[PDB]
């Protein structure tokens, strides 16, 4: 539970750092590094294939959550796998970068809580029944 929240903050600080933002201005290392490279490749693959992740998402401080929950619930509607989790982390980082790009810096701490809550209550079960985060490192990295 604490490692899950520490995982979310690291990935969000990483994606925020790529756009020139700092984490503290708003609010295992192999698992961090592996998830970082997977999120970079995924977001790069998404931009090439389709579009920016959150630019078409007309988000506002009031529309942030009930559009976040619509995406994650649909992403994991018919199962969970490692690639869908990398998709889950990348969508949150793009949401946090989008919130700062639109002068909504009060949302990054909210998104970090929404991700960590879904990580524990809905994603960690599949992690323990599938080797844990250790399996994620031997597959990515």
């Amino acid at each position: 539970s604490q490692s899950n929240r520490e995982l979310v903050v690291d990935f969000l600080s990483y994606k925020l750092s790529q756009k020139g933002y700092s984490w503290s201005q708003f609010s295992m290392a192999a698992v961090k590094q592996a998830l970082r490279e997977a999120g970079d490749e995924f977001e790069l693959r998404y931009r090439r294939a389709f579009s920016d992740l959150t630019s078409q998402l007309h988000i506002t401080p009031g529309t942030a959550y009930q559009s976040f929950e619509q995406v994650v619930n649909e992403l994991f509607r018919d199962g969970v796998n490692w690639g869908r989790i990398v998709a889950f982390f990348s969508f949150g980082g793009a949401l946090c970068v989008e919130s700062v790009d639109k002068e909504m810096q009060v949302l990054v701490s909210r998104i970090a809580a929404w991700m960590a809550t879904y990580l524990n209550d809905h994603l960690e079960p599949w992690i323990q029944e599938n080797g844990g985060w250790d399996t994620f490192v031997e597959l990515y990295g």
């Binding site: 995924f42 619509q70 649909e74 490692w82 690639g83 990398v86 998709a87 990515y140």
Partner: peptide, 24 residues
Amino acid sequence: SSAAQLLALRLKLLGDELHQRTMW
């Protein structure tokens, strides 16, 4: 809304592709 529906869809396919690619 309508873009989140498309965004949710696109996240699936790319996520399932990353899964099957890494799995092999």
